[PDB]
Amino acid sequence: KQPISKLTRATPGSAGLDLCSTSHTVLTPEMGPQALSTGIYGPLPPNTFGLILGRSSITMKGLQVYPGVIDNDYTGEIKIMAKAVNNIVTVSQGNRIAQLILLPLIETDNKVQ
Amino acid sequence: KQPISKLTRATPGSAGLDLCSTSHTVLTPEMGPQALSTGIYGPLPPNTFGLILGRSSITMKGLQVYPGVIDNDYTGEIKIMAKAVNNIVTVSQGNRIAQLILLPLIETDNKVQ
Amino acid sequence: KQPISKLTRATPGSAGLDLCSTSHTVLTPEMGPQALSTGIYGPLPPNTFGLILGRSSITMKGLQVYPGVIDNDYTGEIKIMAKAVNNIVTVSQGNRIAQLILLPLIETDNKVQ
Numbered sequence A, B, C: 001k002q003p004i005s006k007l008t009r010a011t012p013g014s015a016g017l018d019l020c021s022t023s024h025t026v027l028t029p030e031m032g033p034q035a036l037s038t039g040i041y042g043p044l045p046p047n048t049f050g051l052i053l054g055r056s057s058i059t060m061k062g063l064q065v066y067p068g069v070i071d072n073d074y075t076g077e078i079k080i081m082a083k084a085v086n087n088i089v090t091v092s093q094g095n096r097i098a099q100l101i102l103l104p105l106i107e108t109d110n111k112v113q
Helices: A056-058 B056-060 C056-060
Strands: A016-020 A025-027 A034-041 A048-054 A063-065 A069-070 A077-084 A090-091 A096-104 B016-020 B024-029 B032-041 B050-054 B061-063 B066-072 B077-084 B089-091 B096-104 C016-020 C025-027 C034-041 C048-054 C063-064 C068-070 C076-082 C089-091 C096-104
Touching: A016 A034, A016 C016, A025 A077, A034 B061, A048 A063, A048 A077, A056 A063, A056 A096, A056 C076, A063 A096, A069 A077, A077 A096, A077 B056, A096 C096, B016 B032, B024 B077, B050 B056, B050 B061, B050 B077, B056 B061, B056 B096, B061 B096, B066 B077, B077 B096, B077 C056, B096 C096, C016 C034, C025 C076, C048 C056, C048 C063, C048 C076, C056 C063, C056 C096, C063 C096, C068 C076, C076 C096
Parallel strands: none
Antiparallel strands: A016 A096, A025 A090, A034 A077, A048 A069, A048 A096, A063 A077, B016 B096, B024 B089, B032 B077, B050 B066, B050 B096, B061 B077, C016 C096, C025 C089, C034 C076, C048 C068, C048 C096, C063 C076
8 A cells, every 4th residue: 555645746747646557457348447456545635636537648549547536535545447448458567547636625515415 | 406505525525516317317338428417507606617527436337427517607407428338327316426526717818709 | 839828718607718629520439539639739827737628518419528638838739539439420620629627736745757
């Protein structure tokens, strides 16, 4: 288990922290959404939530990442929800597949239930 | 018609306000995107816009929610744009399908047209 | 090459700046993700990153836009990553296909690598 503070940013202007899967990824179109393990765990900095999105090179190779929302106080593993679009898609362990974007968590008066 | 202030947050750390459909949902892959009615209406708090995203349990069951963007002064019904990915997907009325995330609306000098 | 400052907002409450393709768009489901040229170039205002999302009318016509993330200091062309979902999708040059949403780029202590 590693926290998000261990994640790296490709460059200072990068919106996102890079996410890789811990295992070799073979996905076929008939499989439908698969949850890929990262071994990276919440929680997030105070007053922030996380959004998991694909990288564009990976999207273009036909690996779709479904938007993932990570709550501020989630302490579980961050997974990448991924689907092969058209073709069989393979991603080697340790290749960047997704990115974690941190966004402000706006407070509202909505009830909690 | 109910406003977004009636929506509930699963927990205080939840990024999103829960959205359900008002009707029973049967979706097949051949149907393509369907707009699911929530009976919840804009507008949004000042200086905010809304982003509609799927929940991860629902994504993993093969119901994809296409990112929805809700403008700050939209006064219409918030709908969930949904597609069955691989399999026939059923969702009972009142089961959480999507979430509304509120984000800051940054002001720019871009022209309005 | 035009900068994002030339983009227009449909209304003052619009979250997003409108994006069109520079060419006629014919997309079939078997083609998988295609990168549509906009002729609009980064970079983004300081302390912001960009998120590219589809418009909802276009989503509903069966043209899916994959979430695109634009880094703050990206100076290349903003492209729209698009896929025909179910049906052959045509979009005429100059019809709005996507939108660029500007979001705050939160600073973290994460390493840069």
